Structures are given as structure tokens and as C-alpha cells.
């Protein structure tokens, strides 16, 4: 007769009216009301309804399905919340409409689906439906992600030539990650597995196995879905030779030069790396000749009988493409010039795939971008014109570093700072840095423009403040508070090379100077004649230096090099008009000669030369003297203990205490000069080091390459050419370079989770008086 609803708070009344056949002015009986309620639940409009007995006409009660007002995720450690909210959206239930209890389990399995895809093959999910008035519910899914499926073992079958550990060492997938080593992660990925299969193929083709083939790759899960086993069933062939190389295809008239690229010596083992290098050399030769896409297919004809390989290098020099314009996308912060100056491919020139790759690699080397992609789009209405569009994803380039390290040389090294390497997107790198050793407190503020000239010349200024406590550096006590500015132009004259030349003003404040022969000789030669007493002296100099330098860096590997050489020749000569009048030349060198094809055995020749003297009427400052001993210069000795020793004058110390002797204080009973064992350094040093790097003896070969074991022998002598051997005859002649200290020992280096750890035990078998023989040297993460 007249239906009166009680619900319909959220759902429109008309939906219930059309979903309920019986209405006002209609026949009323049990069958009809049953049909109406059945059809009402058929559409699922209402979670619960009822008809309440009423003396007046008819009455209807309605309870709609509880609408969800918010989605709450907890415990989803391995994946972002909105990723699973997109899953909930894709299912068909989201905020703004009702919640279906039946769909809940489908949601639960859906979250299991993407935890399976990401690599968490066990991640339970529980639904929590918190009630809310006005017919609402808030889901609070409790995620309980199980143990991630880590690689329990990587096995190789048929690797009779090479052990499984040796082959897995190069794999980025790791089955063993020691706590003390940083070799990667045990997480398994499809792309990582494919990359490691390619790595295995490269490794086997680099050793002469042209017939090497990966028969199968079994990826198995432990029945708990916690461990993953990778079995690379391979079939290595024999160590084939390289009989000859032929070239074919349209070489476009450059057959002579291409053949000049393809020299091989017969009877030499097939090398996949050499084959790829030859292919890339031909590609680069044709690209330099203007061919954008020089296809090169080096197919091997394999003679199993004679066990030789004949390379048919089919070469197709494609059409010449020209870059109409190079476009940069995503460089919202960095200006166009910053990205364009890193391009080797030039707009308006013929397209070069190698040039584009070099530009992309340089942009990736900038570090300003998360990822750099290149697209050689075809210009519409032009058969051979292209636009080389670069899509870059800008990074938060500014960062503040917080390093903590320990070592015998410098005690505790607290390094901190903040640097914005892309200041205002102009390419300028601004940055303040700070170091606190046991003896040195450095505060730097460097602003550098990497491209002061379009050719690549950099221009960098640096405001530095160095508080050097010589006493804590195992030297004669004196505090040198220096502050100044440097402006240096870096010249990239050649790749692997970089000169530098700059001007720098430095003001040095020397205090608490220990009275000694060398420092007083320098002070006398600087025109000041202060008394040998009054321990707390004071000296101030303002010195302008022309600094020059040359760094040759051919090291194939930045960390743990195996081949190449790094030479750093840095000189500093005082320009006229400065308080100090001296020159000082230093020369570092570290050459790595690999004596085996695997580069496991290396010979390291490390030299450290230095010579400095005044320019007439002045002497080299005592705080600029070279030092040897300690880690990285002459292992087995104390830090800066090699060289001339201070000869303290009879003087009165500021503070006195019996049984300390206060380095020849008058209160202790000293009236004549004394030989002290505290080193002061010398104006010249010469250090050499022959270091035989060997594979770590007792270690798994999977991470043997991550730990560098070495047997080192360091020669080193520091002498002061300005030593007055005439009026100081009883003391040893410190101007004698023949006193070449030598030490021999063993050293371990590896990138522990605490930074680069370097330990060493060395015996100095030829040391002189006053040389503190610290047998054990070490340095925990100097970075």
C-alpha cells in the first residue's frame, strides 16, 4: 500500500524503488515481497535488508554495504603502499564505493601476486575491517612478508676447465655474501640471471672456447620458497685457435684500413673480447668516415678437426645520417649548455652511433641524472636526417657526506661536508668539506666550473683552513694554523691526462714551536732572530704560490687496479712578492703490471719522490717538509717517522713534570743539545715500493677478487739537504740520502661494510736510530 524505507542513507531511493517491484498502491503478499527482496539482493545494492511489521501499511529496513572511506597498509616493507592500492583499484573496489567481503580474499591473493612478482614468494596478508558510522568501513591490511627468496646456491655443470667458484665470482648474482665483504645481494632477478649468463658466455669465449654453449639454465625454488638454486648446465668445448680473419660485405672502399684493423697472430687462442674489440674498431672506423650504423657481424667458422676459428667479419656500412638537432628532455634543473657540452656527437654533423654512446656515457658520468636514454628519432620528410633526443631524469645532485674512519696514521678521521655538484643547474660544483684527524683539522669551501672553456678546461677556487698539530702527527710539537685561497685551471690535454695550474695565497700561523736545529735554521734564514726559549712562539707568513700539476691516469680499474699507471707530478713554486721563497716538487706513481692473463697476480711499482729548496736567501718551511713511514708511504714504520730527527735546543718547557723529560726541557736537567727521536721531516724524500699482489690464499674464490692480498717491500729515505753537517758532526748526517730505510710485509685490502679496510704487518729489517718501527699498520675506511 505504501512502502516506507528506513535505510538508503548512501544509495539513492530510486534505486531501491526500481529494485523492489512492490511499491505504493500495489498488491501485497508473501510471494511478492520475497521476489522483491530476492531481486534487491540480486543486484547487490544492499548488504542486509528486512521488512518490519507495522500496523500502518508497509515498512522496509535497509542496510547498504559499508562504503570504504580509506585504504590503510601496514607492514608492506618491500613495496610502496600505492603500488598495492593500484592492485586494489584494478580489482574493482576502491574508496568511494562499497566494500565486498567476498572480494577480500581476491584482494589478499592479488597482493600475494605482486609479492610473488617482486621476489617475496611468501608474504601473507590479513584484512582488518574497522567500522565507521554512516555505513562506512576502513580496511587496514596487515602485511606479513616472509623471508625473501635469496639464492641459496649457484651451480654450474660441465665446467671441468674452470671451478664453479671462479665463474660465479664474476656473476652479479651472489649465493654467498660474507658479513665482512661487500660483494652484492642474494636477491634473484630474471634480468640479473640473463646478464650473468652473458657474463659466463663472455668468460668462456675469452678463454678460447668458441664451442662453449649453455645447454640449459634451471632455476629452482626450495619447497619453502625461501632458497633459489641456479644450475647453469653448460657444455664447454675446447681451447680453439684463431687461424685467420676475413672481412666481407660493402666496406665502402675502406677495405685496406679495415684489413689493417684485422691483424691476428696465428695459433693464438680465440678471444671473445678481442673479437668484440675488433668489431667495435671497425664500427668506429666507419663512423669516423661518416657511417651512422656500420653493422658488423663476426661469424666464426669453426674447424673442429684442426680446432681453429676463422672469423668472417661481414661489414655493412649503412646510409650516412645527419643530426638535424640534438634535443634534451627532462633537464629542468641543469641548463641546456651543461648537457650539450658533454656531447661528442655534434648537431649539424653526420650521425655517429659511437659518438652518441660516448655522449650518453659522459652524461651518465656527470652524475646529475638518475638515468639517461637516447632516441635517434627520424626527421619527418627527410630520408637521412635524425634528431638525437636525450631523455634525462634529474637527480637531487646536492648531497652531504658523513664519513667516519680509523687508522694508525691519523687516528680517528671524522669527515663531513655538503656539496651541490650542479649549483643552480649551471654545472658549477660548490661544496664545503671538513676533516678531523688526530693531528689535522681541514675546512674547505671549493667552487669549481668544470667547463671554464668550451674545450673542457675547468676553473676551481678553494678556500681552505688547515690546523695542523705536529705533535699529534708524531713530529716535533708545533701548531700551524693556515688559511688561504687557491684558484686552479685544470687542463684536460688528453684523456687519461690532466694538467693543472693555479695561484694560491696561504697565511701560516706557527705557534708552540719546539726549539730545534731545523726549524730555527729556517727561521734564521727567514730574517727573524727570536730566542730559543719561550716554547709558545709565534710566527706569521703570507705566501703566494704558483701550483702546477700533471695527473696521468691509465688505471683500468679505479678500485683494485690490475693494469696501468697513475702518475701525479705536483709542484709548487713561490711567486716573487711572498714571504716564503721556495719551490717544492712531489711525484707520486703507482704502476700495475699484470703478470698473468687473469690479472690475479699483479706487480705494483709505487714511487713517491720529492725535492724542495729555497730560491735564494730563504729556506723551505719546516711545515712543508716531506714525510715517509706509516701506511701508504713506507709500511712498517710510524707515521712520519722516517727522515731527519729534531735536535732540540736546551729550553724551558711551558709545563714540567718529573719522569716525562718533556723532550729535553731545562727543568728536567738539560743544558746541551740532545738527539731526539721525534722526526721532523726533510726537504727531500725518495720512496719506492715493489708490491706483489696475489690472490687471497685461504678464501672462497667467489669473493677472492674482492680481497686483495699483497706482499710489499718498501724502500724509503727522507733527507734534509740543508742540514749543517759541519757544525753538527756528532749527530748523524741527516743530509745523507744513502740511509734508505727498508721494510717488508704483507697487506690485506677489502671493501668491508665499514668502508675500505686496509691492514698490513711489516717488519723494517733496515731501520736507523729514532725510527719507530710500528710493526702493524691499518686503516678502517678512510673515505
Amino acid at each position: 500500500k505504501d512502502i516506507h524505507f528506513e535505510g538508503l542513507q548512501r544509495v539513492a531511493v530510486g534505486a531501491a524503488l526500481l529494485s523492489m517491484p512492490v511499491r505504493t498502491g500495489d498488491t501485497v503478499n508473501d510471494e511478492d515481497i520475497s521476489n522483491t527482496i530476492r531481486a534487491l539482493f540480486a543486484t547487490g545494492n544492499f548488504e542486509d535488508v528486512c521488512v518490519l511489521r507495522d500496523g500502518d501499511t508497509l515498512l522496509v529496513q535497509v542496510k547498504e554495504r559499508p562504503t570504504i572511506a580509506s585504504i590503510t597498509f601496514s607492514g608492506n616493507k618491500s613495496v610502496k603502499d600505492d603500488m598495492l592500492k593500484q592492485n586494489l583499484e584494478a580489482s574493482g573496489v576502491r574508496v568511494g564505493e562499497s566494500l565486498d567481503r567476498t572480494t577480500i580474499a581476491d584482494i589478499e591473493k592479488g597482493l600475494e601476486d605482486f609479492y610473488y612478482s617482486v621476489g617475496k614468494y611468501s608474504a601473507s596478508v590479513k584484512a582488518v575491517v574497522t567500522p565507521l558510522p554512516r555505513n562506512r568501513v576502513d580496511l587496514k591490511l596487515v602485511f606479513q612478508e616472509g623471508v625473501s627468496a635469496e639464492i641459496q646456491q649457484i651451480n654450474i655443470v660441465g665446467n671441468h676447465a674452470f671451478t664453479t667458484d671462479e665463474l660465479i665470482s664474476h656473476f652479479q648474482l651472489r649465493d654467498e655474501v660474507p658479513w665482512w665483504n661487500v660483494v652484492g645481494d642474494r636477491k634473484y632477478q630474471k634480468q640479473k640471471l640473463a646478464g650473468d649468463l652473458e657474463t659466463l658466455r663472455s668468460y668462456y669465449l675469452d678463454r678460447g672456447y668458441a664451442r662453449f654453449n649453455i645447454d640449459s639454465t634451471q632455476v629452482s625454488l626450495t619447497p619453502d620458497k625461501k632458497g633459489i638454486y641456479v644450475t647453469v648446465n653448460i657444455t664447454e668445448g675446447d681451447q680453439y685457435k684463431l687461424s685467420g680473419v676475413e672481412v666481407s660485405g660493402n666496406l665502402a672502399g675502406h677495405s685496406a684500413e679495415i684489413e689493417q684493423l684485422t691483424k691476428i697472430e696465428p695459433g693464438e687462442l680465440y678471444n671473445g673480447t678481442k673479437v668484440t674489440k675488433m668489431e667495435d674498431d671497425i664500427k668506429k672506423l666507419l663512423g669516423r668516415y661518416g657511417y651512422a650504423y656500420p653493422r658488423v657481424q663476426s661469424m666464426p667458422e669453426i674447424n673442429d678437426a684442426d680446432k681453429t676459428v676463422k672469423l668472417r667479419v661481414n661489414v655493412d656500412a649503412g646510409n650516412r645520417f645527419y643530426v638535424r638537432k640534438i634535443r634534451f628532455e627532462g633537464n629542468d634543473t641543469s641548463k641546456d649548455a651543461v648537457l650539450r657540452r658533454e656531447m661528442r656527437q655534434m648537431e649539424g654533423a653526420w650521425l655517429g652511433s659511437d659518438l652518441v654512446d660516448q655522449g650518453k656515457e659522459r652524461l651518465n658520468r656527470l652524475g646529475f641524472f638518475e638515468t639517461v636514454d637516447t632516441d635517434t628519432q627520424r626527421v619527418p620528410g627527410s630520408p637521412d636526417q635524425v634528431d638525437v633526443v636525450y631523455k634525462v631524469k634529474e637527480r637531487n645532485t646536492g648531497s652531504f657526506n658523513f664519513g667516519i674512519g680509523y687508522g694508525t696514521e691519523s687516528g680517528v678521521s671524522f669527515q663531513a661536508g655538503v656539496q651541490q655538484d650542479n649549483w643552480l643547474g649551471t654545472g658549477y660544483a660548490v661544496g664545503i668539506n671538513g676533516t678531523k684527524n688526530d693531528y689535522q683539522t681541514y675546512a674547505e669551501l671549493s667552487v669549481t666550473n668544470p667547463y671554464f672553456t668550451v674545450d673542457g678546461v675547468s676553473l676551481g677556487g678553494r678556500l681552505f683552513y688547515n690546523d695542523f698539530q705536529a705533535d699529534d702527527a708524531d713530529l716535533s710539537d708545533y701548531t700551524n694554523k693556515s688559511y688561504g685561497t687557491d684558484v686552479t685551471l685544470g687542463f684536460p690535454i688528453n684523456e687519461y691526462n690532466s694538467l693543472r695550474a693555479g695561484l694560491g695565497y696561504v697565511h701560516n700561523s706557527l705557534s708552540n714551536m719546539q726549539p730545534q736545529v731545523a726549524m730555527w735554521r729556517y727561521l734564521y734564514s727567514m730574517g727573524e732572530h727570536p730566542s730559543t726559549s719561550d716554547q709558545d712562539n709565534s710566527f706569521k707568513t703570507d705566501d703566494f704560490t704558483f701550483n702546477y700539476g700533471w695527473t696521468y691516469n691509465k688505471l683500468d680499474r679505479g678500485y683494485f687496479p690490475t693494469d696501468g699507471s697513475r702518475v701525479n707530478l705536483t709542484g709548487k713554486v713561490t711567486i716573487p712578492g711572498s714571504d716564503n721563497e721556495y719551490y717544492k716538487v712531489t711525484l707520486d706513481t703507482a704502476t700495475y703490471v699484470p703478470i698473468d692473463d687473469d690479472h690475479k697476480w699483479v706487480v705494483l711499482g709505487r714511487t713517491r719522490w720529492g725535492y724542495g729548496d729555497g730560491l735564494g736567501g730563504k729556506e723551505m718551511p719546516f711545515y712543508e717538509n716531506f714525510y715517509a713511514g706509516g701506511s701508504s708511504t713506507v709500511r712498517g714504520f710510524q707515521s712520519n717517522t722516517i727522515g731527519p730527527k729534531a735536535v732540540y735546543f736546551p729550553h724551558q718547557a711551558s709545563n714540567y713534570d718529573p719522569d716525562y723529560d718533556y723532550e729535553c726541557a731545562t727543568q728536567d736537567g738539560a743544558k746541551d743539545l740532545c738527539k731526539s727521536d721525534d722526526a721532523v721531516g726533510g726537504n727531500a724524500m725518495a720512496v719506492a715500493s715493489l708490491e706483489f699482489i696475489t690472490p687471497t690464499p685461504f678464501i672462497s674464490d667467489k669473493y677472492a677478487n674482492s680481497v686483495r692480498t699483497s706482499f710489499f717491500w718498501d724502500m724509503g729515505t727522507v733527507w734534509d739537504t740543508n742540514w749543517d753537517s759541519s757544525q753538527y758532526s756528532g749527530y748523524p748526517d741527516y743530509s745523507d740520502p744513502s740511509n734508505i730505510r727498508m721494510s717488508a710485509g704483507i697487506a690485506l685490502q677489502w671493501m668491508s661494510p665499514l668502508g675500505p679496510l686496509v691492514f698490513s704487518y711489516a717488519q723494517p729489517f733496515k731501520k736507523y736510530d729514532g725510527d719507530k718501527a710500528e710493526q702493524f699498520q691499518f686503516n678502517i675506511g678512510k673515505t
Partner: peptide, 7 residues
């Protein structure tokens, strides 16, 4: 140890 944080 060395820490660096991208802000």
C-alpha cells in the same frame, strides 16, 4: 665508513 646522503 663513509656517509653521504642525497638531499
Amino acid at each position: 665508513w663513509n656517509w653521504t646522503k642525497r638531499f
